[PDB]
Amino acid sequence: MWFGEFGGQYVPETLVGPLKELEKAYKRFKDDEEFNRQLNYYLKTWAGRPTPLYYAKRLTEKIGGAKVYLKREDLVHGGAHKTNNAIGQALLAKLMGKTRLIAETGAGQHGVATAMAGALLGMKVDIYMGAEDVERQKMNVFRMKLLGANVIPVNSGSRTLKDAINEALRDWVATFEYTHYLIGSVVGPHPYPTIVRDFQSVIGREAKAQILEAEGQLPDVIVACVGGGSNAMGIFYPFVNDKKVKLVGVEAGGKGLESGKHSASLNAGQVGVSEGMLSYFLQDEEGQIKPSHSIAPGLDYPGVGPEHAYLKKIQRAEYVAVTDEEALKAFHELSRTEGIIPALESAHAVAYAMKLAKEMSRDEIIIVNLSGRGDKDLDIVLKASGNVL
Amino acid sequence: MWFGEFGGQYVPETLVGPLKELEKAYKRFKDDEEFNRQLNYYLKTWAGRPTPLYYAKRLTEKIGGAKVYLKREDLVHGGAHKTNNAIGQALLAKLMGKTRLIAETGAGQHGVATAMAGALLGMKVDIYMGAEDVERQKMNVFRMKLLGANVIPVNSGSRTLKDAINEALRDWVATFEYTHYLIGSVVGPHPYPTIVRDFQSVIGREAKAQILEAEGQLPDVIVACVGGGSNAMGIFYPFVNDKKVKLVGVEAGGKGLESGKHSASLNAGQVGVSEGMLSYFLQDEEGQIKPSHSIAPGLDYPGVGPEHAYLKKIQRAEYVAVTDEEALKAFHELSRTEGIIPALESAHAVAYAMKLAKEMSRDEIIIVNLSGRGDKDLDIVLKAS
Numbered sequence A: 001m002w003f004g005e006f007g008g009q010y011v012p013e014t015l016v017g018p019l020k021e022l023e024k025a026y027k028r029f030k031d032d033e034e035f036n037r038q039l040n041y042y043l044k045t046w047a048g049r050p051t052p053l054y055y056a057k058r059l060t061e062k063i064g065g066a067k068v069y070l071k072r073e074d075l076v077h078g079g080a081h082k083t084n085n086a087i088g089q090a091l092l093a094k095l096m097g098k099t100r101l102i103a104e105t106g107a108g109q110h111g112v113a114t115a116m117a118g119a120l121l122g123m124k125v126d127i128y129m130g131a132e133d134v135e136r137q138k139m140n141v142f143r144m145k146l147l148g149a150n151v152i153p154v155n156s157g158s159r160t161l162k163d164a165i166n167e168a169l170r171d172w173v174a175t176f177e178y179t180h181y182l183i184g185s186v187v188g189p190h191p192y193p194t195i196v197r198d199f200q201s202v203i204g205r206e207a208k209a210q211i212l213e214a215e216g217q218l219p220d221v222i223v224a225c226v227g228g229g230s231n232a233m234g235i236f237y238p239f240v241n242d243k244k245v246k247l248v249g250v251e252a253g254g255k256g257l258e259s260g261k262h263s264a265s266l267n268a269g270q271v272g273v274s275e276g277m278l279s280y281f282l283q284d285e286e287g288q289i290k291p292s293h294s295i296a297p298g299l300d301y302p303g304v305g306p307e308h309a310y311l312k313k314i315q316r317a318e319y320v321a322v323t324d325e326e327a328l329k330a331f332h333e334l335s336r337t338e339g340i341i342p343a344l345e346s347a348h349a350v351a352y353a354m355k356l357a358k359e360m361s362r363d364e365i366i367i368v369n370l371s372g373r374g375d376k377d378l379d380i381v382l383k384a385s386g387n388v389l
Numbered sequence B: 001m002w003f004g005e006f007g008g009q010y011v012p013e014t015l016v017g018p019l020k021e022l023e024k025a026y027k028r029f030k031d032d033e034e035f036n037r038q039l040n041y042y043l044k045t046w047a048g049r050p051t052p053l054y055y056a057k058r059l060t061e062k063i064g065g066a067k068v069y070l071k072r073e074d075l076v077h078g079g080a081h082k083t084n085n086a087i088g089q090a091l092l093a094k095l096m097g098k099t100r101l102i103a104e105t106g107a108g109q110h111g112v113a114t115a116m117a118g119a120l121l122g123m124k125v126d127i128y129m130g131a132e133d134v135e136r137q138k139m140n141v142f143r144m145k146l147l148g149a150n151v152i153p154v155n156s157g158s159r160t161l162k163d164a165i166n167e168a169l170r171d172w173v174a175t176f177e178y179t180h181y182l183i184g185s186v187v188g189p190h191p192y193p194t195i196v197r198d199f200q201s202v203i204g205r206e207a208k209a210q211i212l213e214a215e216g217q218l219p220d221v222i223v224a225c226v227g228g229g230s231n232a233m234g235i236f237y238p239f240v241n242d243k244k245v246k247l248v249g250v251e252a253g254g255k256g257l258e259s260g261k262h263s264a265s266l267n268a269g270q271v272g273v274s275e276g277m278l279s280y281f282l283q284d285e286e287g288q289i290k291p292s293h294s295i296a297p298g299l300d301y302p303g304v305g306p307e308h309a310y311l312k313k314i315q316r317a318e319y320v321a322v323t324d325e326e327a328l329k330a331f332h333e334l335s336r337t338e339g340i341i342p343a344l345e346s347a348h349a350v351a352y353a354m355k356l357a358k359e360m361s362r363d364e365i366i367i368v369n370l371s372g373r374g375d376k377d378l379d380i381v382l383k384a385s
């Protein structure tokens, strides 16, 4: 449950039983040949794995430095890496004998991923979403409706994500016998940080094989955006024991690190307990959890996964920040230069990789995790483009 | 040029020259080692080929008939088969020394596909679009602008697709030396029907290898939706000389074939010369081209590919139709049962494959071409709810 001094299981006794049951079931299935055959079968035929490793020739030549490769998670069924974890936990729940899936979502991406995985495996899906988020995300709610899921509008409290998490936990305590709580990032109490990283590690394993086949050598740098940290841990984990492979996590710098309007937990956060884990969280002068900000909804989270807290502490990974403006510039640049519209989350990683490439040799290799496609973000980018001049 | 008694190059002499130059170039490159190496490289690393063949276990089981496999073109970069042809023609153009691509679009889909391919290969992209259509598809116009393409708005005449085609054709007549006219379906004058089919034939070749891996036998039936006919020709062509394999195109039945609001050209159309080809077109009592209808914008074409007319004539492939309602039924059904939101176009093919599955036995196999994903069609589906 620990990554050095980070992680744990800081939950009420009511949640201890369910988590213990999950850990035991995972220990059985994680190395079980049939579980892995079915998972790999669904990832191949339903999700379209493997995703390609793409050499961004035009972007690389424009910068005039390091070769920039994009791990094309944008091409996974659903348009985001989140599908990898949604399939894994849904199949685990079904093989555990669960009949129902519950999850929470703010912007809807995890909700859609969960709804999709549920439909595939013929399980019931209830997604907890704040009614304020429901009114903001009409298409994603319709999507979840289409996929045979019920969006439970959370009218209580702030009608936000926090309230949906509380209602989802309260649901799970009562229903854990037949219901599985599908967490969408490497966050929360053990064993969720480990399970989600294990179900995203396929990104790194493909990327390693693909760069070795294409370039006959390991990458110099791997760059991934870090919200909770699942896409980053996914591409990082298989390279951790490759000492000369630099690992760079890019957090949401928002309106700037000095503005207090960002989600850079590792950069500016303090070590403390929240959402059942010991990790870095954005805190006010008192020590209360400070609200976060990013133009990218997927990065807009006050906390970060404990394994990233560990990788920072042992200095195995460097953690940096890119601003809303820098991410928007990278969104436009990749679109026009390579004909790939990135998720605004992924655009944070593209933004930092473009800066790093300029200072590096043409023989050096950067792999960027392109965690998703930016179709979902077109309204946000249009509004920001209309606010110019 | 000819598929039996259909096809041709029925164009003014201004267009004959450029089309003849395109014929020569395609002949020089179609089997060229380097062109095919680059095309396969872009299809693999950029578009994400090969696309998987998915066994819809739950759909197969609830029907209680033939095993239904889905060729997942919905997973291609851009979310539709159109990308395969966009990359092919865009690369051919670049290797021909063309610096520019032009196209026209009404819904915006072919415009986006062309804009994406042009961006990849570092070519100028101008998309002719009727000012009316521009207003109706603001996000697809934004997409094209994001991808570095210029949307040249056509306010001349009705500000529709017809006007945009004329302006684009006038452009290519002038600019063919440095510009390639990118056609998105197996329609218009030679060599476009043959080129677009050859750049979509990858779908059927992959499907054949994949079905032989999964089942150790060829499929009994292959079902594909037919608008102009590119995705259907793509999955059909490699199985044409496999006599035992049945080929079914599903045209848009619309509000009904009797209602006069449909796009089933091969069904209720008549032979005529329009858009530079001899094929089946929807015609009124005057002989004038009747307006098409389909809830699926991609199937909303009064015309059809000349190679489908040939396959209909020689009875190598059957051509059926499915209503707007049956398609919406299949859109919801695949979404809820298999967790794949299909394009309304692709939903037509799913709908008939569900009917034809019931008729056949459990040991028999249907491959359905899932030509695209339905993210683009969500607003249309909500409106019809």
Ligand code: NA
Binding pocket: A226, A227, A228, A251, A263, A264, A265, A299, A300, A301, A302, A303, A304
């Ligand atoms: Na954070």
Ligand code: NA
Binding pocket: B226, B227, B228, B251, B263, B264, B265, B266, B299, B301, B302, B303, B304
């Ligand atoms: Na038609």
